[PDB]
Amino acid sequence: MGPVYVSGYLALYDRDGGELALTREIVAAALPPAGPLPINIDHRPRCDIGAVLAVVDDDRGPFFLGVVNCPQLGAVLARAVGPDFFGDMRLSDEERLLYLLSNYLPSASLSSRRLAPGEAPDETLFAHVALCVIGRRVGTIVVYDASPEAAVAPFRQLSARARSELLARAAESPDRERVWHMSEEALTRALLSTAVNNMLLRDRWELVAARRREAGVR
Amino acid sequence: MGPVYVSGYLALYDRDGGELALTREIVAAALPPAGPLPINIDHRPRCDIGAVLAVVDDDRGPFFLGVVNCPQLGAVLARAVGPDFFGDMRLSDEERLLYLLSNYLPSASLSSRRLAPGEAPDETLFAHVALCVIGRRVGTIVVYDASPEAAVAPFRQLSARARSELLARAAESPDRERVWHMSEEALTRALLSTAVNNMLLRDRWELVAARRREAGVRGHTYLQ
Ligand SMILES: [Cl-]
Ligand SMILES: [Cl-]
Ligand SMILES: [Cl-]
Ligand SMILES: [Cl-]
Ligand SMILES: [Cl-]
Ligand SMILES: [Cl-]
Ligand SMILES: [Cl-]
Ligand SMILES: [Mg+2]
Protein backbone atom coordinates (compact mmCIF):
# COMPACT_ATOMS: atom_id res chain seq x y z
CA MET A 1 0.00 0.00 0.00
CA GLY A 2 2.07 2.92 -1.41
CA PRO A 3 2.82 6.51 -0.24
CA VAL A 4 0.63 9.52 0.45
CA TYR A 5 1.54 13.13 -0.27
CA VAL A 6 0.73 16.13 1.84
CA SER A 7 1.21 19.79 1.12
CA GLY A 8 0.44 23.23 2.36
CA TYR A 9 1.64 26.59 3.59
CA LEU A 10 3.78 26.34 6.69
CA ALA A 11 3.13 30.06 7.28
CA LEU A 12 1.62 33.11 5.49
CA TYR A 13 3.68 36.34 5.54
CA ASP A 14 2.09 39.35 7.32
CA ARG A 15 -0.81 37.35 8.80
CA ASP A 16 0.22 36.28 12.32
CA GLY A 17 1.94 38.22 15.09
CA GLY A 18 4.09 38.09 18.17
CA GLU A 19 5.77 34.75 18.57
CA LEU A 20 4.13 33.25 15.51
CA ALA A 21 4.96 35.60 12.72
CA LEU A 22 7.45 34.43 10.06
CA THR A 23 9.50 36.97 8.21
CA ARG A 24 10.73 36.87 4.66
CA GLU A 25 14.39 37.25 5.71
CA ILE A 26 14.21 34.50 8.16
CA VAL A 27 12.43 32.17 5.74
CA ALA A 28 14.94 33.16 3.06
CA ALA A 29 17.77 32.41 5.49
CA ALA A 30 16.24 29.09 6.50
CA LEU A 31 15.97 27.48 3.01
CA PRO A 32 16.80 25.02 1.77
CA PRO A 33 16.47 23.18 5.07
CA ALA A 34 19.79 21.74 5.99
CA GLY A 35 18.74 18.23 6.91
CA PRO A 36 15.83 15.83 6.52
CA LEU A 37 12.72 17.55 8.06
CA PRO A 38 10.58 14.87 9.49
CA ILE A 39 6.83 14.79 9.70
CA ASN A 40 5.15 13.52 12.85
CA ILE A 41 1.83 13.62 14.60
CA ASP A 42 1.17 16.47 17.07
CA HIS A 43 4.90 17.04 17.65
CA ARG A 44 5.36 13.63 19.31
CA PRO A 45 8.86 12.15 19.28
CA ARG A 46 9.13 8.50 18.26
CA CYS A 47 6.21 9.30 15.96
CA ASP A 48 7.74 9.99 12.52
CA ILE A 49 5.54 8.84 9.67
CA GLY A 50 7.14 10.78 6.84
CA ALA A 51 9.30 13.67 5.71
CA VAL A 52 9.18 17.04 3.95
CA LEU A 53 10.47 16.48 0.46
CA ALA A 54 10.82 20.14 -0.31
CA VAL A 55 9.92 23.57 0.93
CA VAL A 56 9.76 26.65 -1.30
CA ASP A 57 9.49 30.37 -0.76
CA ASP A 58 6.21 31.20 -2.42
CA ASP A 59 5.13 34.85 -2.55
CA ARG A 60 2.57 34.34 0.16
CA GLY A 61 4.73 32.18 2.50
CA PRO A 62 6.85 29.07 2.77
CA PHE A 63 5.02 26.13 1.20
CA PHE A 64 5.85 22.45 1.61
CA LEU A 65 5.36 19.05 0.07
CA GLY A 66 5.68 15.91 2.13
CA VAL A 67 5.53 12.19 1.81
CA VAL A 68 3.78 10.08 4.49
CA ASN A 69 4.56 6.45 4.04
CA CYS A 70 3.57 4.34 7.02
CA PRO A 71 1.58 1.17 6.20
CA GLN A 72 0.22 0.76 9.75
CA LEU A 73 -1.25 4.19 9.68
CA GLY A 74 -3.75 2.90 7.09
CA ALA A 75 -4.43 -0.27 9.05
CA VAL A 76 -5.17 1.66 12.21
CA LEU A 77 -7.44 4.27 10.63
CA ALA A 78 -9.30 1.68 8.49
CA ARG A 79 -9.86 -0.54 11.53
CA ALA A 80 -11.40 2.40 13.38
CA VAL A 81 -14.14 3.37 10.95
CA GLY A 82 -17.52 1.90 11.60
CA PRO A 83 -19.20 -0.24 9.00
CA ASP A 84 -21.64 2.44 7.68
CA PHE A 85 -19.37 5.46 7.68
CA PHE A 86 -18.88 5.14 3.89
CA GLY A 87 -22.54 4.20 3.23
CA ASP A 88 -22.72 2.27 -0.05
CA MET A 89 -19.37 3.47 -1.41
CA ARG A 90 -16.63 1.02 -2.16
CA LEU A 91 -13.26 2.62 -1.66
CA SER A 92 -9.74 1.43 -2.20
CA ASP A 93 -7.62 1.19 0.83
CA GLU A 94 -5.66 4.17 -0.57
CA GLU A 95 -8.81 6.29 -1.04
CA ARG A 96 -10.14 5.53 2.43
CA LEU A 97 -6.84 6.43 4.05
CA LEU A 98 -6.76 9.73 2.10
CA TYR A 99 -10.19 10.67 3.22
CA LEU A 100 -9.64 9.68 6.90
CA LEU A 101 -6.36 11.51 7.13
CA SER A 102 -7.76 14.59 5.47
CA ASN A 103 -10.44 14.88 8.05
CA TYR A 104 -8.66 13.59 11.12
CA LEU A 105 -5.47 15.63 10.70
CA PRO A 106 -6.31 18.65 8.51
CA SER A 107 -3.53 21.03 9.60
CA ALA A 108 0.20 21.30 9.91
CA SER A 109 2.52 23.03 12.40
CA LEU A 110 6.14 23.85 11.69
CA SER A 111 8.39 23.85 14.70
CA SER A 112 11.69 25.74 14.62
CA ARG A 113 14.77 25.83 16.81
CA ARG A 114 15.30 28.48 19.41
CA LEU A 115 18.17 30.83 18.36
CA ALA A 116 20.89 31.86 20.75
CA PRO A 117 21.66 35.57 21.30
CA GLY A 118 22.99 37.35 18.18
CA GLU A 119 22.98 34.07 16.33
CA ALA A 120 21.80 34.81 12.77
CA PRO A 121 19.14 32.33 11.58
CA ASP A 122 20.33 29.83 8.95
CA GLU A 123 19.41 26.55 7.25
CA THR A 124 19.23 24.79 10.64
CA LEU A 125 16.14 26.76 11.80
CA PHE A 126 13.26 24.43 10.88
CA ALA A 127 13.04 21.28 12.94
CA HIS A 128 10.00 19.37 11.79
CA VAL A 129 6.39 19.48 10.72
CA ALA A 130 3.58 18.11 12.79
CA LEU A 131 0.24 17.07 11.53
CA CYS A 132 -2.50 18.22 13.82
CA VAL A 133 -6.13 19.24 13.85
CA ILE A 134 -5.69 23.06 14.07
CA GLY A 135 -2.40 24.87 13.65
CA ARG A 136 -1.92 28.15 15.43
CA ARG A 137 -0.70 29.97 12.29
CA VAL A 138 -3.07 31.49 9.81
CA GLY A 139 -3.85 29.33 6.75
CA THR A 140 -1.99 26.18 7.82
CA ILE A 141 -4.35 23.64 6.24
CA VAL A 142 -3.00 20.62 4.45
CA VAL A 143 -4.22 18.64 1.46
CA TYR A 144 -3.38 14.91 1.23
CA ASP A 145 -3.53 12.96 -2.02
CA ALA A 146 -2.04 10.14 -4.13
CA SER A 147 0.52 12.11 -6.15
CA PRO A 148 2.52 15.21 -5.39
CA GLU A 149 0.68 16.85 -8.31
CA ALA A 150 -2.72 16.17 -6.87
CA ALA A 151 -1.60 17.20 -3.35
CA VAL A 152 -0.62 20.76 -4.46
CA ALA A 153 -3.31 21.27 -7.08
CA PRO A 154 -6.00 22.76 -4.84
CA PHE A 155 -3.77 25.71 -3.74
CA ARG A 156 -5.01 28.34 -6.09
CA GLN A 157 -2.74 31.19 -5.06
CA LEU A 158 0.45 29.17 -4.99
CA SER A 159 2.60 30.70 -7.75
CA ALA A 160 3.25 28.60 -10.85
CA ARG A 161 6.91 29.24 -10.38
CA ALA A 162 6.91 27.95 -6.78
CA ARG A 163 4.85 24.86 -7.66
CA SER A 164 7.37 23.99 -10.39
CA GLU A 165 10.38 24.34 -8.08
CA LEU A 166 8.51 22.41 -5.41
CA LEU A 167 7.66 19.36 -7.46
CA ALA A 168 11.11 19.27 -9.08
CA ARG A 169 12.98 19.37 -5.84
CA ALA A 170 10.63 16.83 -4.29
CA ALA A 171 11.30 14.37 -7.14
CA GLU A 172 15.00 14.56 -6.29
CA SER A 173 14.67 14.24 -2.51
CA PRO A 174 16.54 11.26 -1.03
CA ASP A 175 13.63 10.58 1.33
CA ARG A 176 11.09 10.16 -1.42
CA GLU A 177 11.19 6.37 -1.57
CA ARG A 178 11.44 5.83 2.22
CA VAL A 179 9.23 3.85 4.56
CA TRP A 180 8.31 4.48 8.12
CA HIS A 181 7.12 1.27 9.80
CA MET A 182 5.58 1.96 13.18
CA SER A 183 3.94 -0.15 15.84
CA GLU A 184 0.13 -0.22 15.44
CA GLU A 185 -0.20 0.08 19.13
CA ALA A 186 1.95 3.28 19.34
CA LEU A 187 0.00 4.82 16.44
CA THR A 188 -3.31 4.05 17.96
CA ARG A 189 -2.14 5.82 21.09
CA ALA A 190 -0.80 8.87 19.23
CA LEU A 191 -4.06 9.26 17.35
CA LEU A 192 -6.22 8.78 20.40
CA SER A 193 -4.13 11.53 22.01
CA THR A 194 -5.10 13.77 19.14
CA ALA A 195 -8.78 13.22 19.80
CA VAL A 196 -8.64 13.58 23.53
CA ASN A 197 -6.60 16.74 23.31
CA ASN A 198 -9.04 18.22 20.83
CA MET A 199 -12.25 16.81 22.23
CA LEU A 200 -13.30 20.19 23.77
CA LEU A 201 -12.40 22.30 20.74
CA ARG A 202 -15.45 24.35 19.76
CA ASP A 203 -16.56 25.10 16.16
CA ARG A 204 -13.70 23.08 14.71
CA TRP A 205 -15.20 22.76 11.17
CA GLU A 206 -15.82 26.51 11.09
CA LEU A 207 -12.10 27.17 11.99
CA VAL A 208 -11.00 24.61 9.34
CA ALA A 209 -13.10 26.36 6.70
CA ALA A 210 -11.45 29.63 7.85
CA ARG A 211 -7.99 28.07 7.49
CA ARG A 212 -8.90 26.90 3.98
CA ARG A 213 -10.20 30.31 2.94
CA GLU A 214 -6.91 31.78 4.33
CA ALA A 215 -4.71 29.33 2.42
CA GLY A 216 -6.71 29.94 -0.80
CA VAL A 217 -8.29 26.46 -1.18
CA ARG A 218 -11.85 26.41 -2.73
CA MET B 1 -9.85 3.05 40.59
CA GLY B 2 -13.51 2.16 41.34
CA PRO B 3 -16.81 1.88 39.45
CA VAL B 4 -18.55 4.97 38.10
CA TYR B 5 -22.25 5.41 37.51
CA VAL B 6 -23.91 6.81 34.43
CA SER B 7 -27.54 7.85 33.89
CA GLY B 8 -29.88 9.73 31.54
CA TYR B 9 -32.95 9.51 29.29
CA LEU B 10 -32.65 6.92 26.50
CA ALA B 11 -35.43 8.78 24.65
CA LEU B 12 -38.05 11.39 25.16
CA TYR B 13 -41.59 10.62 24.06
CA ASP B 14 -42.82 12.60 21.03
CA ARG B 15 -39.43 14.29 20.54
CA ASP B 16 -38.00 12.39 17.50
CA GLY B 17 -39.29 11.55 14.09
CA GLY B 18 -39.83 8.36 12.18
CA GLU B 19 -37.14 5.72 12.63
CA LEU B 20 -36.00 7.26 15.88
CA ALA B 21 -39.29 7.75 17.84
CA LEU B 22 -39.92 5.48 20.79
CA THR B 23 -43.55 5.43 21.80
CA ARG B 24 -44.95 4.76 25.32
CA GLU B 25 -46.41 1.57 23.97
CA ILE B 26 -43.08 0.29 22.64
CA VAL B 27 -41.37 1.10 25.96
CA ALA B 28 -44.13 -0.41 28.09
CA ALA B 29 -43.80 -3.49 25.90
CA ALA B 30 -39.99 -3.61 26.08
CA LEU B 31 -39.64 -3.25 29.89
CA PRO B 32 -38.33 -4.73 31.94
CA PRO B 33 -35.62 -6.18 29.71
CA ALA B 34 -35.46 -9.91 29.11
CA GLY B 35 -31.75 -9.94 30.00
CA PRO B 36 -29.15 -7.34 31.23
CA LEU B 37 -28.24 -4.61 28.70
CA PRO B 38 -24.52 -4.11 28.27
CA ILE B 39 -22.96 -0.70 28.00
CA ASN B 40 -20.39 -0.43 25.22
CA ILE B 41 -18.44 2.26 23.50
CA ASP B 42 -20.12 3.74 20.43
CA HIS B 43 -21.84 0.48 19.46
CA ARG B 44 -18.62 -1.38 18.85
CA PRO B 45 -18.82 -5.06 19.59
CA ARG B 46 -16.26 -6.72 21.88
CA CYS B 47 -16.05 -3.56 23.92
CA ASP B 48 -18.43 -3.86 26.80
CA ILE B 49 -17.39 -1.63 29.72
CA GLY B 50 -20.43 -1.79 31.97
CA ALA B 51 -24.10 -2.55 32.19
CA VAL B 52 -27.46 -0.97 32.56
CA LEU B 53 -28.54 -1.63 36.15
CA ALA B 54 -32.15 -0.48 35.66
CA VAL B 55 -34.54 1.25 33.24
CA VAL B 56 -37.82 2.97 34.13
CA ASP B 57 -40.68 4.51 32.26
CA ASP B 58 -40.71 8.04 33.51
CA ASP B 59 -43.49 10.27 32.26
CA ARG B 60 -41.20 12.01 29.80
CA GLY B 61 -39.45 8.86 28.56
CA PRO B 62 -37.35 5.83 29.41
CA PHE B 63 -34.60 6.66 31.87
CA PHE B 64 -31.68 4.48 32.88
CA LEU B 65 -28.98 4.05 35.48
CA GLY B 66 -25.80 2.12 34.63
CA VAL B 67 -22.40 1.13 35.98
CA VAL B 68 -19.02 1.45 34.18
CA ASN B 69 -16.15 -0.41 35.72
CA CYS B 70 -13.35 -1.09 33.31
CA PRO B 71 -10.13 -0.65 35.16
CA GLN B 72 -7.95 0.04 32.14
CA LEU B 73 -10.11 2.98 31.02
CA GLY B 74 -8.64 5.41 33.40
CA ALA B 75 -5.10 4.51 32.53
CA VAL B 76 -5.75 4.73 28.74
CA LEU B 77 -7.51 8.07 28.99
CA ALA B 78 -4.96 9.54 31.32
CA ARG B 79 -2.13 8.34 29.11
CA ALA B 80 -3.84 10.22 26.22
CA VAL B 81 -3.94 13.73 27.68
CA GLY B 82 -1.11 16.14 27.31
CA PRO B 83 0.78 16.79 30.53
CA ASP B 84 -0.43 20.39 31.06
CA PHE B 85 -3.97 19.34 30.24
CA PHE B 86 -5.25 19.93 33.77
CA GLY B 87 -2.96 23.01 34.25
CA ASP B 88 -2.60 23.67 37.99
CA MET B 89 -5.51 21.56 39.21
CA ARG B 90 -4.93 18.81 41.68
CA LEU B 91 -7.43 16.05 40.90
CA SER B 92 -7.84 12.54 42.21
CA ASP B 93 -7.60 9.71 39.70
CA GLU B 94 -11.27 9.22 39.92
CA GLU B 95 -11.98 12.90 39.24
CA ARG B 96 -9.71 12.88 36.22
CA LEU B 97 -11.51 9.84 34.79
CA LEU B 98 -15.00 11.31 35.35
CA TYR B 99 -13.97 14.54 33.71
CA LEU B 100 -12.40 12.82 30.71
CA LEU B 101 -15.30 10.39 30.25
CA SER B 102 -17.89 13.06 30.72
CA ASN B 103 -16.47 15.10 27.93
CA TYR B 104 -15.30 12.29 25.64
CA LEU B 105 -18.58 10.42 25.78
CA PRO B 106 -21.30 12.78 26.82
CA SER B 107 -24.30 10.96 25.35
CA ALA B 108 -25.96 7.61 25.18
CA SER B 109 -27.73 5.66 22.44
CA LEU B 110 -30.15 2.81 23.03
CA SER B 111 -29.81 0.21 20.29
CA SER B 112 -32.73 -2.09 19.39
CA ARG B 113 -33.01 -5.51 17.80
CA ARG B 114 -34.18 -5.30 14.14
CA LEU B 115 -37.57 -7.06 13.99
CA ALA B 116 -38.77 -9.50 11.38
CA PRO B 117 -41.85 -8.62 9.43
CA GLY B 118 -44.85 -9.58 11.56
CA GLU B 119 -42.79 -9.51 14.73
CA ALA B 120 -44.20 -7.43 17.56
CA PRO B 121 -41.97 -5.52 20.00
CA ASP B 122 -41.36 -7.44 23.27
CA GLU B 123 -38.91 -7.69 26.23
CA THR B 124 -36.03 -8.75 23.91
CA LEU B 125 -36.35 -5.54 21.83
CA PHE B 126 -33.54 -3.62 23.63
CA ALA B 127 -29.99 -4.73 22.88
CA HIS B 128 -27.48 -2.37 24.40
CA VAL B 129 -26.66 1.15 25.41
CA ALA B 130 -23.75 2.70 23.69
CA LEU B 131 -21.80 5.64 25.12
CA CYS B 132 -21.13 8.21 22.35
CA VAL B 133 -20.70 11.84 21.39
CA ILE B 134 -24.21 12.84 20.33
CA GLY B 135 -27.01 10.32 20.13
CA ARG B 136 -29.50 10.57 17.30
CA ARG B 137 -32.42 10.95 19.77
CA VAL B 138 -33.40 14.19 21.44
CA GLY B 139 -32.42 14.67 25.09
CA THR B 140 -29.95 11.70 25.37
CA ILE B 141 -27.20 13.40 27.34
CA VAL B 142 -25.77 11.44 30.22
CA VAL B 143 -24.34 12.28 33.60
CA TYR B 144 -21.37 10.44 35.16
CA ASP B 145 -20.65 10.40 38.89
CA ALA B 146 -19.01 8.35 41.67
CA SER B 147 -22.34 7.28 43.13
CA PRO B 148 -25.73 6.36 41.69
CA GLU B 149 -27.81 8.90 43.59
CA ALA B 150 -25.34 11.62 42.51
CA ALA B 151 -25.49 10.37 38.88
CA VAL B 152 -29.25 10.80 38.86
CA ALA B 153 -29.60 14.03 40.82
CA PRO B 154 -29.14 16.63 37.99
CA PHE B 155 -32.25 15.40 36.15
CA ARG B 156 -34.62 17.87 37.65
CA GLN B 157 -37.79 16.59 35.83
CA LEU B 158 -37.42 12.93 36.52
CA SER B 159 -40.41 12.03 38.70
CA ALA B 160 -39.68 11.06 42.32
CA ARG B 161 -41.59 7.82 41.75
CA ALA B 162 -39.48 6.84 38.76
CA ARG B 163 -36.33 7.93 40.55
CA SER B 164 -37.16 5.76 43.61
CA GLU B 165 -38.11 2.83 41.39
CA LEU B 166 -34.90 3.24 39.39
CA LEU B 167 -32.66 3.18 42.44
CA ALA B 168 -34.44 0.22 43.98
CA ARG B 169 -34.09 -2.00 40.93
CA ALA B 170 -30.46 -0.97 40.52
CA ALA B 171 -29.77 -1.80 44.12
CA GLU B 172 -30.76 -5.37 43.23
CA SER B 173 -29.03 -5.70 39.83
CA PRO B 174 -26.70 -8.67 39.49
CA ASP B 175 -24.28 -6.44 37.58
CA ARG B 176 -23.78 -4.01 40.52
CA GLU B 177 -20.31 -5.41 41.46
CA ARG B 178 -19.06 -6.70 38.13
CA VAL B 179 -15.80 -5.62 36.57
CA TRP B 180 -15.08 -5.48 32.82
CA HIS B 181 -11.48 -6.11 31.96
CA MET B 182 -10.07 -5.23 28.51
CA SER B 183 -6.48 -5.07 27.33
CA GLU B 184 -5.09 -1.55 26.98
CA GLU B 185 -4.72 -2.13 23.28
CA ALA B 186 -8.28 -3.20 22.71
CA LEU B 187 -9.61 -0.26 24.70
CA THR B 188 -7.40 2.31 22.92
CA ARG B 189 -8.69 0.96 19.63
CA ALA B 190 -12.28 1.30 20.75
CA LEU B 191 -11.86 4.85 21.99
CA LEU B 192 -10.01 5.90 18.81
CA SER B 193 -12.90 4.45 16.90
CA THR B 194 -15.38 6.82 18.51
CA ALA B 195 -13.13 9.76 17.58
CA VAL B 196 -12.87 8.64 13.95
CA ASN B 197 -16.58 7.92 13.58
CA ASN B 198 -17.51 11.27 15.05
CA MET B 199 -14.79 13.49 13.59
CA LEU B 200 -17.08 14.93 10.87
CA LEU B 201 -19.79 16.02 13.36
CA ARG B 202 -20.60 19.72 13.31
CA ASP B 203 -21.41 21.96 16.30
CA ARG B 204 -21.07 19.13 18.80
CA TRP B 205 -20.82 21.32 21.88
CA GLU B 206 -23.79 23.44 20.87
CA LEU B 207 -25.65 20.12 20.30
CA VAL B 208 -24.49 18.89 23.72
CA ALA B 209 -25.82 22.05 25.37
CA ALA B 210 -29.10 21.56 23.51
CA ARG B 211 -29.34 17.91 24.61
CA ARG B 212 -28.88 19.08 28.20
CA ARG B 213 -31.70 21.57 27.94
CA GLU B 214 -33.90 18.93 26.29
CA ALA B 215 -33.36 16.40 29.08
CA GLY B 216 -33.86 18.98 31.87
CA VAL B 217 -30.34 19.15 33.30
CA ARG B 218 -29.26 22.62 34.42
CA GLY B 219 -27.44 23.77 31.30
CA HIS B 220 -23.74 24.45 31.59
CA THR B 221 -23.04 28.14 31.38
CA TYR B 222 -19.84 29.96 30.47
CA LEU B 223 -20.82 33.57 31.40
CA GLN B 224 -17.88 33.89 33.91
CL1 LIG C 1 14.08 21.86 -0.13
CL1 LIG D 1 1.38 26.01 15.16
CL1 LIG E 1 4.78 32.58 -11.29
CL1 LIG F 1 -17.86 22.32 14.17
CL1 LIG G 1 -34.47 -2.79 34.40
CL1 LIG H 1 -28.82 7.31 18.69
CL1 LIG I 1 -18.73 22.76 18.68
MG1 LIG J 1 -8.80 12.92 -5.90
Residue numbers in the entry:
A (entry chain A): 1 to 218
B (entry chain B): 1 to 224
How does the study describe this entry?
Herpesviruses encode a unique serine protease, which is essential for herpesvirus capsid maturation and is therefore an interesting target for drug development. In solution, this protease exists in an equilibrium of an inactive monomeric and an active dimeric form. Here, we report crystal structure analyses of the active dimer, the diisopropyl phosphate-inhibited dimer as well as the non-inhibited monomer of pUL26N from PrV (224 amino-acid residues). The tertiary structure of pUL26N is a β-barrel consisting of a four-stranded antiparallel and a three-stranded mixed β-sheet surrounded by eight α-helices.
In the native structure, a chloride ion occupies the oxyanion hole, which is formed by the β6-β7 loop (residues 133–142, further referred to as oxyanion-hole loop, OHL). The backbone N-H of Arg136 provides the first hydrogen-bond donor of the oxyanion hole. A water molecule as second hydrogen-bond donor supports anion stabilization, as does the positive local environment established by these two arginine residues. An extensive network of hydrogen bonds stabilizes the OHL. Moreover, the N-termini of helices α8 of PrV pUL26N point towards each other with the positive dipole moment compensated by one chloride ion per monomer. The quaternary structure is a homodimer related by a two-fold non-crystallographic axis with an interface area of 1,273 Å2 (native dimer) and 1,258 Å2 (inhibited dimer) comparable to all previously published structures (~1,300 Å2, determined by PDBePISA). The native and inhibited dimeric structures of pUL26N are nearly identical with an r.m.s. deviation of 0.39 Å (437 aligned Cα atoms, secondary-structure matching) over the whole dimer. A putative cation was found in both dimeric structures from PrV. Since the crystallization buffers contain MgCl2, it is highly probable that these cations are Mg2+ ions. Thus, Mg2+ ions or divalent cations with related properties are presumably necessary for the observed crystal packing of dimeric pUL26N from PrV.
